[PDB]
Symmetry: D2
């Protein structure tokens, strides 16, 4: 309740899924939180539910939306300590030949350039507060994923960008880290599974992809984010895996 008292946090895509779990974790640590989302439904209800969280409608791909997000955060709360770049999307499975450069550009706009834009606009205020940036990347940026060339590329970019920016902002006391979740049970996971011939089988495979035998929860990503913000003062440029061990060992993926 006090680990991050008196601090101000912006969470993009905070209306549902991982983002909402990160919102709740920061509120529970004593922070005031600005929920940014392009859709009103979840975020507006979360603002009613949580004292200390407020909702601001903002599409992170629209630069003037993000400019307003930052200026309204400062106007209303007087400081900015942490930005969590969580907004992002996973398209359905697509074979390489079914992808397009246009679709690839549009996904880069959300998953990469939206993170870039908010970070850039927030950094002057984070420097004043010796605050920090937390990017939500993905395990599959590191190890790959099938039928997801554009998504994997965007997350490779986020993880790498995190390290570059950590180098540049270290002289100013601003840390820049990322979390790479694996399979987290969210509305996006549920939506993608419902597209499959056997959704139930897809979900069962997703649970057994982890040595721990289950998918992760938004609250567990949220706890990792609170750690990075509030207690990881000698961490910068790290990639914090929240994956249940999916990257470990051999699995189903004589010598001719």
């Amino acid at each position: 309740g006090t680990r991050y008292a008196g601090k101000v946090v912006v969470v993009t895509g905070g209306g549902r899924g991982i983002g909402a779990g990160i919102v709740r974790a920061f509120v529970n640590s004593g922070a005031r939180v600005v929920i940014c989302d392009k859709d009103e439904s979840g975020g507006r209800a979360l603002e009613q539910e949580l004292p200390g969280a407020v909702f601001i409608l903002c599409d992170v791909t629209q630069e003037d939306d993000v400019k307003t997000l930052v200026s309204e955060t400062i106007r209303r709360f007087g400081r900015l300590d942490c930005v969590v770049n969580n907004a992002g999307h996973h398209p359905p499975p697509q074979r390489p030949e079914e992808t397009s450069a246009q679709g690839f550009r549009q996904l880069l706009e959300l998953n990469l350039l939206g993170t870039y834009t908010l970070t850039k606009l927030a950094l002057p205020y984070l420097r004043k507060s010796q605050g920090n940036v937390i990017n939500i990347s993905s395990l599959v940026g590191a190890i790959g994923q099938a039928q997801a060339v554009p998504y994997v590329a965007t997350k490779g970019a986020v993880t790498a960008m995190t390290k570059a920016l950590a180098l540049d902002e270290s002289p100013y006391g601003v840390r820049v880290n990322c979390i790479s979740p694996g399979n987290i049970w969210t509305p996006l996971w549920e939506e993608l599974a419902a597209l499959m011939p056997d959704p139930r089988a897809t979900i069962r495979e997703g649970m057994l992809a982890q040595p721990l035998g289950r998918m992760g929860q938004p609250a567990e990503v949220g706890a990792a984010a609170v750690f990075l913000a509030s207690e990881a003062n000698f961490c910068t440029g790290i990639e914090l895996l929240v994956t249940g061990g999916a990257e470990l060992g051999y699995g189903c993926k004589p010598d001719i």
Copy 2:
């Protein structure tokens, strides 16, 4: 002279630097090589110099240029075995606040989407030949670099994309690998150093950034590419470091 005899290779940005070193290595291994470049000067001279190499003017950011590159390769040589996605650029040092989303998009077009586009157009022919893709990424995609947020992000994306595509194309016998060079002495390195207050000091630092005490050569990247194409039949999705050890150990980058 025979390790890759009878094979056909496309090298983008093959007119100078690393690309020209890769062109020479493949010619020396017995392959026929198509030199793709947006500038004529170097590539046209290389075509005159090397029996077995020919030059095709092609800007990899222009989709119809790349369509023509592939169709002309097939028309002239009847097969395609390896594409080397080397074309790319490093902008001058830029502090994060000096970058723009527009500049970032333009660098993504070259360093990432140009690699994507040629790979996509070539894959039908690589499937027929059980050929392979070699992407030239960078060490700094893995470890970061100062004053280079956009460049680092693009190379993070290339390395990650390499792994995704290796997964998707493995059922068809097409391997997809990347090389991550460190400091290689090229015209781009020389151009960037000439921008500095003390170019000579910049070059000296660049040499001592490697435990081996020197920068790398285009020929050394070229040898790694020939290995991946011709002898690495159980390698796919790997990142082959050609860096002189720059990523090893501690260097210049009490507890408060």
Copy 3:
């Protein structure tokens, strides 16, 4: 004060340095802590200082010492939830030709097999409590270090062993993670620096090896350990870097 209330933690080498910082962090989170050390001086004073910590003399290289450590922990506190394998040593700088197989074996006994032995003896009790293992490895296991072949090898082994054991113990709900610190200001760091021709210069270099410009603190490693024990329920087999960014970018470590 309550994040790990009611839990019982063993910290090896807890008498000073990183180990004592981990002891304090767990006490501050509400846990009861058993301080294991081969030397009495620091650990006995820490037991007097901290309600909720007690000292047990134990050399982790002596199997019967470790057997007694575990049985006394259970006898006195009735459960065991977390073991932190921190005991370890860094020999002075040694050129490869100045090392011996005998010295290498002895360092393996402490840095690797002592971690192995306590983990093995504790696992039956950790299974009952759904507890967890935290190994203190090092950044240099991942990236190397000069004049330290035996030390680097031992830490490579610890990090790898962490992943293997995480796989084996995941069906039982026992997580196994490691922390890889970089330069942490401790008595061992101070002792090694005092061996150098210019200790002050050695310490200054050690501070500037991190983008953050300082060495880390035992308290910061301790906070990472409390996170892994108490809040990282979907993390297993991870390597949590606490290094101030030392692994990022180029530093001091034309093409002939």
Copy 4:
């Protein structure tokens, strides 16, 4: 036939499996090769088969055997250019509680200290020749393996040691690299599979653990070793994966 002409190579455990594939690759590149093995059967036959290879009986865990191996290589061939530390063993599957510290020590003697000992005794001659070291580690040192805590630990140590030694020997022009194979079809693989309830099923799983759908061959590891020795002049401290992509993506290894 000429890539490594006039050079002298020692391959430990060269009598069968990966080691014999590395022997053949170097002979085919023009090198003279000393086959070291503790068993005579395979290595003696290979010496009869291959002009340019000779067999020396040597147990790499016995220091005087290794001293004699080096002195006999120099006495007979007058130089030493490359040592390939391939000798090693994988014990049968063992649950953590079924392992012993004694068994762990014995495996460290072979997989780690035997590599250390030959490297140390060879380095004076490698410095004279500007030669290189190639260690055969394993993919599972990086990602873990089930029921193999001691084996995984030894390979974690080898990979890490490779980087440390590359740092120390770089001022002298001696490169130190490792190869991390995945599933390679060898007599050891066949022996381990025959221990299983369903050997055929074990072998089928082993083939499908790779995106490429097969196990690797000793010849493919051998080609990687020849590359590292003869053409990778700007590579030191690297880990060259020869795994068929087993480390990529998700596999078989809702949120509670």
